[PDB]
A paper describes a structure:
WD repeat-containing protein 5 (WDR5), a core component of the mixed lineage leukemia (MLL) methyltransferase complex, directly binds to kinesin family member 2A (Kif2A) to regulate these mitotic events. In addition to transcriptional regulation, WDR5 also functions as a scaffold protein, facilitating the assembly of diverse protein complexes through its WD40 repeat domain, which forms a β-propeller structure. WDR5 has two distinct binding pockets: the WDR5-interacting (WIN) site and the WDR5-binding motif (WBM) site. Emerging evidence suggests that the non-canonical role of WDR5 in mitosis is mediated by its interaction with Kif2A, a kinesin-13 family member that specializes in microtubule depolymerization.
To further explore the role of the residue at position +4, we determined the structure of WDR5 in complex with a Kif2A 114-122 peptide carrying an S121G mutation. Interestingly, Gly121 in Kif2A still forms a hydrogen bond with WDR5 Tyr191 via its backbone carbonyl but loses the hydrogen bond interaction with Lys259 observed in the WDR5-Kif2A_ 114–122 complex. Structural superposition of WDR5 in complex with Kif2A 114–122 and Kif2A 114–122_S121G revealed that the conformations of residues around the S7 site, including Phe133, Phe149, Pro173 and Tyr191, remained largely unchanged. Surface analysis revealed that the S7 site can be induced in Kif2A 114–122_S121G-bound WDR5. These results suggested that the carbonyl group of Gly121 induces Tyr191 rotation similar to that of the hydroxyl group of Ser121. However, the S121G mutation in Kif2A reduces its binding affinity for WDR5 by 3.8-fold, confirming that Ser121 at position +4 drives Tyr191 rotation more efficiently. Interestingly, we also demonstrated that the hydroxyl group of Ser121 in Kif2A is more efficient than the carbonyl group of Gly121 at promoting S7 pocket formation (Ser121 K D = 0.78 μM vs Gly121 K D = 3.72 μM).
Residue numbers in the entry:
A (entry chain A): 31 to 334
B (entry chain C): 114 to 121
């Protein structure tokens, strides 16, 4: 069977490239970050603009939700992360210590920690309550494109333009595993699978790969899209059929069958690089967002 | 802008 994602809403309002969209864990909201220095909150089901959250002095590259859906963290070119109370819109904490653009960020499931990756080639682990940087990992030798906690928070996966994917022990900060492949093309994105056993890694040779990271074996590859220049988010879609979902530099959203690797759908409508996609936690809904020549978020809905 | 929205 194949999905039939259809366009439901186009969300306009950002005045520069959108950089990242994330659904709240409770399914109610979509958060978007933008080069226009703003976070915007939208209704996940009717597409209705809810609010604007502001305070970064430069554009934002990533945003992430706490498990209880009450907080956001954003990563900015202004070298800071900010922790935000969604209901009030207030900045609760400004996390300082990176020496270049902060690129990627995430909460752990407990949501007592934040992990960040930066152009300064480090991964930092931050205390949410106090805002203090707990650890600075000399993780990579080029900008860090993605950081993600596994399901119990005990592991972090990081990716970098240096061509490496690394698995880190959260508590000890030591590197547990380094994944290298072929001629080590830049790794533009990585994240754990929902069950925590796999990682999905994007490389700028137009390729996504599913890895058993402990065994160091590439189980799947997903190709056919265009990804040579940008750090594009990819996703496991698990609310219906088991798909892989990714944006693309040919302005399309691609959806693959996870097991067969075949493309099962291509979503048309954006007019610039689809830098970010996200999958709704309970419904067969995709959010997609695109760069400067587009500036919109689209919501798509499928029967499976 | 933002680093993610720039090529590299």
């Amino acid at each position: 069977v194949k999905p039939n994602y259809a366009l439901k809403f186009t969300l306009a309002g950002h005045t520069k490239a959108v950089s990242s969209v994330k659904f709240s864990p409770n399914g109610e909201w979509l958060a978007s970050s933008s080069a226009d220095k703003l976070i915007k909150i939208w209704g996940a089901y009717d597409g209705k603009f809810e609010k604007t959250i502001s305070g970064h002095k430069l554009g934002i590259s990533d945003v992430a939700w706490s498990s209880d859906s009450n907080l956001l963290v954003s990563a900015s070119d202004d070298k800071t992360l900010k922790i935000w109370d969604v209901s009030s819109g207030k900045c609760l904490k400004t996390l300082k210590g990176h020496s270049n653009y902060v690129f990627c960020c995430n909460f752990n499931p407990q949501s007592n920690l934040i992990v960040s990756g930066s152009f300064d080639e480090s991964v930092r682990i931050w205390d949410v309550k106090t805002g203090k940087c707990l650890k600075t990992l000399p993780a990579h030798s080029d900008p860090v494109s993605a950081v993600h906690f596994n399901r119990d928070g005990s592991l972090i996966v990081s990716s970098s333009y240096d061509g490496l994917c690394r698995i880190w022990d959260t508590a000890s900060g030591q590197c547990l595993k380094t994944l290298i492949d072929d001629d080590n093309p830049p790794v533009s994105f990585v994240k754990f699978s929902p069950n925590g056993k796999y990682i999905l890694a994007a490389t700028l040779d137009n390729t996504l790969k599913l890895w058993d990271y402990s065994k160091g074996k590439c189980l799947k590859t997903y190709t056919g899209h265009k990804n040579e220049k940008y750090c594009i988010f990819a996703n496991f879609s698990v609310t219906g059929g088991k798909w892989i979902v990714s944006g693309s530099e040919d302005n399309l959203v691609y959806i693959w069958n996870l097991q067969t690797k075949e493309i099962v759908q291509k979503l048309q409508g954006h007019t610039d690089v689809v830098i970010s996609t996200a999958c709704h936690p309970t419904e067969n809904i995709i959010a997609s967002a695109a760069l400067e020549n587009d500036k919109t978020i689209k919501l798509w809905k499928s029967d499976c | 802008g933002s680093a993610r929205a720039r090529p590299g």
